[model samples]
Target: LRPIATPYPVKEWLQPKRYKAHLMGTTYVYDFPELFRQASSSQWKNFSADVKLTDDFFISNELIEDENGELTEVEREPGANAIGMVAFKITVKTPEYPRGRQFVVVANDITFKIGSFGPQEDEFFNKVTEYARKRGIPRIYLAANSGARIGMAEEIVPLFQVAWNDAANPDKGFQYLYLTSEGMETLKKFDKENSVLTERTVINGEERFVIKTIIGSEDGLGVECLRGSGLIAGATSRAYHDIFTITLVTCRSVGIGAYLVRLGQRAIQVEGQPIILTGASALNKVLGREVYTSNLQLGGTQIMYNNGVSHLTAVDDLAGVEKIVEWMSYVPAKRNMPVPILETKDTWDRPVDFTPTNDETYDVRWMIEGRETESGFEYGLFDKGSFFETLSGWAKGVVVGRARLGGIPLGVIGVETRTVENLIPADPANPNSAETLIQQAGQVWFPNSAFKTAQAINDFNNGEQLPMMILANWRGFSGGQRDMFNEVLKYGSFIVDALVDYKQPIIIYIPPTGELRGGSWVVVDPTINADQMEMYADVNARAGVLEPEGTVEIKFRREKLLDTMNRLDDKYRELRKQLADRERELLPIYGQISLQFADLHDRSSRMVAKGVISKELEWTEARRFFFWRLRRRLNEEYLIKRLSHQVGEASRLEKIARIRSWYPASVDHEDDRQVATWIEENYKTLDDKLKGLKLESFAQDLAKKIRSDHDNAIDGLSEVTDDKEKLLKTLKL
Candidate 1:
C-alpha cells in the first residue's frame, strides 16, 4: 500500500500564529483558517481563481461597470487593495432564472480591521447596490462589520483636535473657540462667520450652534467619504425599492452591521451570533449600573425576532445560506414580472374537506391536503407542497409564505398551530426537550403570530402583486403572562395596519370548527383590507365576538346586571327536556355525539343568521366557489375595490373589549377572576339544563321536534359539489 494518499505535514495540523482583532468596541474580531476551513468544508477551495475566502481572511476575484457605465476589470485591485474584503458577486440561479437576474454577495473581512467598514467600504457598498439595481438583480449580505470606521474621514477629523497644527490657526474656515473656566465655563468664538455647514438652532430653548461633522467634513467635502454612514445608509434605502435584499449575520454585528442585517427583507441570524446597537458594557456604563448583560441576551435570536426586528434565524453559516436560497425562490426578480407557475403533482380537483375529528386537535392543512396524513402551511391548497416559508424560524405560530394555487402564483398567510413545531421551550435542561415542557398541544394565539401574519401580508401587498388567502382560526389572543409583557396590543395594531394598507385581492377563509373570534378577527376584518372582497366559512365553522364560554359569560352577566342571565339557560333548560328525544333521533342517525352541542351558542347557524359571514360552503366545494368569487370581484375593478377599508370609530379597544383586548393595567383583567366572576354572575345558571342534556341517557322521554341537518335539508356537501362544477365551468378564463 502506497500509504493510501499523500499525508500532510505536522505543520499543517499544528501551526502557531499570533493573531489579534478588535471590533464593535467589544464582540469583535477574529476568525481562523482552520475554523473557516471547518465551515467551508468541500467548498473551501471551490471558489474560482482571483477570489479567496477562509477563516484567516476574505478576498474576492471580481470585476464590474464604472461610474460612466464603462466596463472595468478591477479584480486585482478589489482582491488585494480594496478596503473591505471582496468576494465574487455570487447568486443562486435556477433553470427559470437567467444569469441576468443573478445575485452577488460582498462581506467584510475580520482579517482586515476586524471586519470594520469605512470610506472604501461605503464606495464598494454603493457600487454593489447600484450595480445590483441597474442589473435588476438581488444583493445578499454576509454581515460582520466592526462598526463604521471612526473618522478615517480626511475631510473632517478622523483624529479629533488634530486638524490644523495651530490651535488658533488663523484660517477663517476653521471655527475656533477659546474657553474660559469658572463655576460656568464660557467660550470665545472667532469672528469667522457661521457657514451653511453649521446650524444655529435652539437647544434647551436657547440659541445653540451645532455643526454636523462626519469623517472630517471641515474640508467642505459635501461629498462625505470613507464609509460615510449617512451616504451608505441612503444608498441602502434606495436599493430596497429596486431589488430584493438578504443578510446573514454570522458573527458579532454592531451599529451599522446591525442595521445591515435588519434591512434585508429576510434577515437570518446565525445562533451564537448577535446584532446590537451598542455593546452591553457601554450600555451598562451609560446607565451607571452592574447590568452585567450578555451581548446575546440583549440581541439574541429569541429577543430580536420576537421584537419583529429580524425575519429569520439559523443555527450556522450553512443554514443561513440555505435559507437565502430558499427565500430567493419565493419572490420574483422584480415587480411587473408575472410569477412563474409551479408544476403541481396533485390533481386540480383532488377532493378536500374540513372535517373536525372528536378528541383530536385539527390542523387546517389537513383540510387542504384532503387526507389523513399530517401536514403544514403548504400541504394541499398551496399547490400540494410548493410553499416557501419566509419567516418560518421566527414566528412559527402564524405561517406566511409564497405558494401556488392550482398553478396560479399567490401568497398564502395562515394562522398556525399554537403548538410551534410544538417547541420554543425556555432554558431547558435537555434543550431538545422543549415539547416535554408542554402539558398538552393546543393552538394559543400570541403577539408574534399577529406580527408574522401582518408582515407576510405587507410582503404581498406592498411589493409583489399577488392574490392572497388568509387562513383564519383561533380562539382569540392569548391572555397569559407572555401576552402581558410583549405589547400584544401594539402588534395587534400592526395586524390592523397591514390589513389597512393591503392593495391586492384578499380573502379570509375560516375553516371548519375554526372560530375567528376576538383579537384574531380584529386582525383580518374585511373592513380593514379593501382588497378583502369576500369572506367564506365552512358550514361547521363557529365565530363571534368571543368564544363559546366567553359569549355565554357575557350573556350570563347581563342576566343579573340587566336581569336576563337565564334567558339562554332558561331556553337551554327548556330545550334540554326535548334533548333526549332529539338525541334518540340523532344517536341512531349519527351514532354518537357530545351533549354540549345543543347548548353551544357560537355555531355556524348563529354566524350565518347574524350575517357575520358572506357565505358558507362545504370544505370540498369552498376552493372552487371562492376562486370564482375572487376572480369575479378581481375582474371587476369597482367590485374588488368596493369595500371601504376605512375603519370606523370602533377603537381597537372595542375589538378587544370582551377578552382579547386588555393591557397590563386592566382590572377584570386577572383572567382567573374574570372567568370566575362571569361564572358567579350566572350563579348555577346551567343547573337545570345540565340535568337533561346528556349522551349517557339514551333519549327516553324528550320530544324529537329539534331538527338535524338531514331534516333541515342543509346539505353543504351535495350543495358544494354542484357549486364547484358550475363555478369551474364559469371560471375558465
Candidate 2:
C-alpha cells in the first residue's frame, strides 16, 4: 500500500532536493563584454577607445508568434536583443610595438539566441574579417557559439490536426494529417504554397483540408541559415589564407562554429570548453544509448590539443587572450612588414651556462633557453624569456618554437636527446583493444618529427616570415619497416625541399658535443641551399657521413689497418711481427686505435678544414657570432634588394671598377668593411660620380647605410674588439 514498503527513506521518483551547497570547481561563464575586458589591455578596460558602435552590425526587428497564435514583429535594441555578435579593432601596446599594434577582435555574445550564427551575425563576421584583411592586420576570433539559429512557425503548432486510422485506438498511427478551414485561411495569409502541402478529402461528409508536410515560412527558421554559415566559412577560409587568423574558444563551439575554428588553423581552446561539430546528445540519440555524458566528452582540450586541432590550451579566457598576444609578438606588425624587434637588457655576448657532455643526454631547451643558477645567475643563447613554443604537444621529438637573438626574431628547432615513449590511443571501434606504446630512440628522426620539422620551416618562411635557426644534432632518420610504412623517407625529403626553397637566412649549428651524421648531414648540408643556408659547428661538435665506429668498420679493414700501422707506428709493426702467429690478438688493439683516429676525423676542426662548415666556433662564442652573422646577412639582403630596384648589373660593375681604381687595397680585400670604409672616406667623390649619372640618392644614402651595417656587425662581435694577446691567452697559445 505504501509503495510496497520501500527499503529507502523515500521512493526514488518522489525524493526531494537534498544537496543545497554550491558545487566547487565549476566553470564560471563570463559575459561577452566581461570576457573581452579580462582579455584586453587594462588601461582601456572602461573606454572603447577607437571602437565605434557604427563598426558593429545588428538586426532591428524579429518576427514571432504572439500569445493569440498570430504573427507579430517586435522591435529590438542593438546591445539588448538584436545582435549575438560584437566586433571592433583593439590596440595592443608592447615593447616591440611602442606606439601600438591594432588587431580586430570579434566575440560571440551567448546571451542573444545562445550565441547562434544567424544571417545578421554572419554578415557582421564577414565585414570584420574583410576589414582586417584589407588593412593587413591580424584577425582574432573569440568563438562561443551554439551554431546556426533555428526558428519555427509557432502559429501552426496549435491548429494542426492528425487524422488517425482507427480513431478509438491512435496507436495505429495517422491516415491524413489536416488543418481546420480557419487555420488553413490563417496559413494562407502567410506563404500558402511554400509553407505546407494541402489536398482536399471528405471525412464524415464534411469538407476537410489535409496537410501533407509543413515547412516553416521564415527567413531564419531552418536550413536557410546554412546559407549564412557557408558565407562566413568561406570568408574565414580566405582570411586564413591571406592574413593572420587565430581563434580562441572561450566557451563551447558547435556545428559551423567548430569548422570556423579549424579553418582559422591556429586555435586556442579554453579549459573545459568543447569544439565539436555535433553535440553528445545527438550522437547518443543516434546510438540509442546514453553513450556520452557531456559535450566535453566529444571535444575537450585533451582530445583537441593532443590531436593538434588546438595549437594552444589556456586555463581561462583571459589566459587564452594573453597567449594570442604573446604569439603575435613573434609575428610581424602587419603582412609583408618586417618582424617586430624588441629592446632587451640581455647582452649579445654571454657564455652559455649549459653544455652537454659527449655521451650524456641533456635537455636541448636548457641549451636554447639556458639555465638560471641557484645563486640567481642566468646565461643563454637567446634573450631571456623570449622563447615561446608552439605545437608543443604534437611531434615532441623535434622541438620548434620562436626565440629572439639580440632582439631579432628567429624560428628555432632543436632535437630531443632523450628516448620518447609515445602512446598510441586505442581504436574507438574496438572496445577490447589496448593502447600501443612506441619507444622512439633519442637523437633520431622519425616520420612524425621529420614532418614537424618541415612544417615548422615552411611556416617560418612563408607564414611568419622569420629567419630560421636549426640545432643540428639528429643522428639519422629511422628507416625501419614501421617508420618507412609511415612515409619517413617522403617526410625526410620534405625537410630538404623546405630548406632549398627558403628565401630567408637559415643557420644550422651543431652544438657542443652534438653529432650530425648519416642522412641527417646530407639533408641539412649548406650545398642544398647555398644561397640562403649556412652551416656552423662548435669546437666540441661532430659531423660526418657516418659515426666513428661505423666509418671504421667500413673503411678500416684488416689490410688497411696493417697499412696504417706500417706507415705510422713502429711499435705496432714490431708487435705484429713478434706476434705473427697471434696476429689476430694484436688486430683488436690496432682496431681500437684506428677507431680513435677515425673519430678524430669527425671533429668540427676537421669539418672546417675540409670546407664542410663555415667556421669552427666555441659554444660560448655562438651567441655573439650568430647575432652579428644574422645582422650582416639581413643588412646585405636589404642592400641587394635596394640595388636590384634601380641599378643594372653593368652599371653596378662600372661603379665597382671606378671604386677599385680609387682604392685598390680595399677592393682587393675579402672583408666588406674595407670597401665600407672606402665608401665613407670618398663619400664626396662617389656622390659626384653618381650625380653625373643622376644617381646621387643611392650614393649618399646607400653609402651611409652600408657603413653603419658594417660598423654594427664589427661592434657586435667581441672577437673583433679583443686584442691578440687576450685572444692568445683565451686559447692558451
Candidate 3:
C-alpha cells in the first residue's frame, strides 16, 4: 500500500484571540459587576496610578422617595434581585491624556432581569447621564439589555383559571380568563382595589370571577416602565447636546434600548447583536406568518450598519470597548476642552509611501489609512492605525473618519474613487419584484452620501469639536431625478452649513490625481468658512467649474476652436480657407486640442495663481505639510481664544480682526514654532495694552463715530489705535 501524502496537516496548537484573551473573563458579559470592575480595574492597573471610583454603588440596591420629594435609600427585598444597571466615574489613560481623564461609564448588567430597564435602572441611567452632562465629561453607555422591563402579577398568575370552550378537551382555546372565589378573596387581601376588570359568573356549578383585562397590579413595570423609558430617552437626547454621548451595544438591544442607542447619536454595535424596535417573532405574529427567522434578520449589522444607524461594529465585547476607547482618543477628554492629540512613532517629516494616479479605482481608506505589507507598512497622510472610520457601510462614495496627523487629532473626509454597488431592498408594497442592485458612480455625491457627509461633519464639529480635513475628489452632487427627489440638494447644502458653523480649523485638500468640480468645489470652498477653513490642492489635482471635457464643450466651440487655431498655428492660418472647406475633417482634431487647452486651465498652479486654493503641494509632501499646517492653525486658534478671554466684553469682532492683522505683521514665516515664539513673547504685553485702552470706552467711542460717519469712522479706527511700528516697538521687539 502506498503511503498517503497530505499537503495540509492539522495543527495541534491554536492561536489565542487577540482582544478577547486580554479580557478578564468571558467575552459575553453575564456578571455585570465583575465585567464593570474588569473594564475599570484593568485601566487602573494599566495606568498604575491612584485611581478611585466615584458613586461605585450607585443604584446597587433600592431607593424610596420621601414626602419631601428626596430619594432615600432602602434595603432590597428578600427575594428581589439587584438593579440591572450600574454607574460610576472611571479615569482612563490615553496617549494624549497620560495623567488620566475621567469619564462616566453606565452599563446595563445582563445578569439581572436580562439587563431590563425598570424604573430604577431608567432613573439610574438618567442620573448618570445628567451627572456627566453637568460635569462636561464623556458619557459612555455599555448596553446589553432586553429593553424596558415587563412584569406581571406572579402571585395572581398561579391562582387564575382559564375558561375553556370545551372542558373535556383542555387543548382547545380559552373563552375567557377567570379567577376562583378563593383567588378573588386572596387578591383583595393582597392587592387593594383589585387591579383588574372582572365580572362574576356561574360556571360548572361554582361562582367564578372573570377578568377581561389585567391591569398592572405591580409597581415599576408595564406602563410605568415606558414612562421611565421616555424620561431616559429625553435625558439621552439632552445629553447629546451637552456632553459626548456614545453607546456600545454589547448585546441585543430591543425597544427603548434601541432608541437609546440612536439617541446617543454615536453607537458601536457588537457583531451578531441586533438593535430592533420589536422582535422578529412579534412582527411575524402580527403579520400571521413567519416572515423572519430571528431578531438579527431585522437589525443585524448588515441592516443597521448599511442604513447608517450603527456607526461601527465590533466582533465582541472587548473589541467593542477597544473601539470605543479608540474613538474617544480623537475626542477631547471633556466638553469645552481642546481635542486630545496622541503621540505616535510615525514622524512628521516622512513622506507618504502610497501615491495614487488618475483613472484608478481604489478604496479611499487605503489613502487615509496606509496599507500593510509583508516588508513594512506604507504610510498614509494620517498616523499609523489612527483612522477609525464611522458610518463606513452606508456611504460607499464618501469615507469619513477620525485620524491623527503628527499626533494632532483631525476629522477626515475622503472620497471613494470606485464605482459602488448599492443593493436596494425590495419594496414591501411591490411583492412581485425582488431586491435590485444599483451602481453608484464614484466621485459623485448621492443623497445618502451627502447626508452622511453632513452628519459626520456635524458630529466632529459639534460633538467632538475637532479640526477637520476634507480630501475632495467629487465631481458634484448627483442631480438626477431620483437624487433630487431624495433631497440631494438639501443635504449638499447641509455640508456647507456645517462648515459655516465650524469653529475649529478646517483643511480641504484635493488629493493627487483627484478632481473637484461644479457644486463640489462650491460646497467645500474656503470662502464658506474664511476664518477657520482653508483650501489646498495637490500638484496633480484638478478643480474647475466643470471638468475639462464639459468646459471645452461649452466654452471652446467650433468657432472659438478655429479662431484659436488661426492665432496659434501658422499652418492653420495659411490653410484657413482650405480648412474652412474641410471643416468636418478638422472637427475631431480641433476638439481634442480644445480639451487639452481646457485641461491646462484646471491645473493646481492655475488655481493657486487665481487665488482659488491657498497653495499647491506634492502628494508625497502632504503629510508633512498638513501636520505643520494644522499645528500652526491650532496654536493660532488657541492664542485667539486666550486673547478673547482677556479682553472682557468689547467689540470682539473688531478685536479678532485686529489680532488676525497682527499675526502676519509679527511673523514673517509660516513656521509653527515662529508663530508660537512670537505669541509667547507678545501675548502678555498685547494683553496689557488692550486692557489699558479701556476697550469698553474705546468701543463705545468707535460705535458713536461709526453711527455718525460709518465709512469715515471705519477708516479712522486704525488711526485711533497704535501704529504697527509703534506697537512692535512698545512690545520691545
Highest-lDDT candidate: 3
Instruction: Return the TM-score for candidate 2, rounded to 2 decimals.
Output: 0.74
Q: Which has the higher TM-score value, candidate number 2 or candidate number 3?
A: 3
Candidate topping TM-score: 3
- What TM-score fits each model? 0.58, 0.74, 0.78
Task: Put down candidate 2 lDDT per residue, 589-675, tens digits, no spaces.
Answer: 777888888888888888888888888889887887788777656644543443444444545345344445666653543444454
Query: Which segments of model 2 are wrong by more than 4 Å?
Result: 1-81, 150-168, 174-184, 196-215, 221-224, 227-230, 375-378, 425-429, 493-503, 522-531, 562-584, 605-613, 639-733
Would you list the rank order by lDDT, best first? 3, 2, 1
Comparing 1 with 2 on lDDT, the higher-scoring candidate is 2
CA lDDT of each prediction against the hidden true structure = 0.54, 0.73, 0.77
Give the per-residue lDDT of model 1 (tens digit) for 672-691: 33433443343344333333
Clashes of each: 14, 0, 0
Off by over 4 Å in 1: 1-78, 85-100, 104-106, 131-136, 151-227, 234-242, 280-298, 305-308, 353-358, 363-379, 393-396, 417-445, 462-466, 478-486, 550-615, 621-733
What's model 2's lDDT at 575?
Answer: 68
Estimate the lDDT of model 3: 0.77
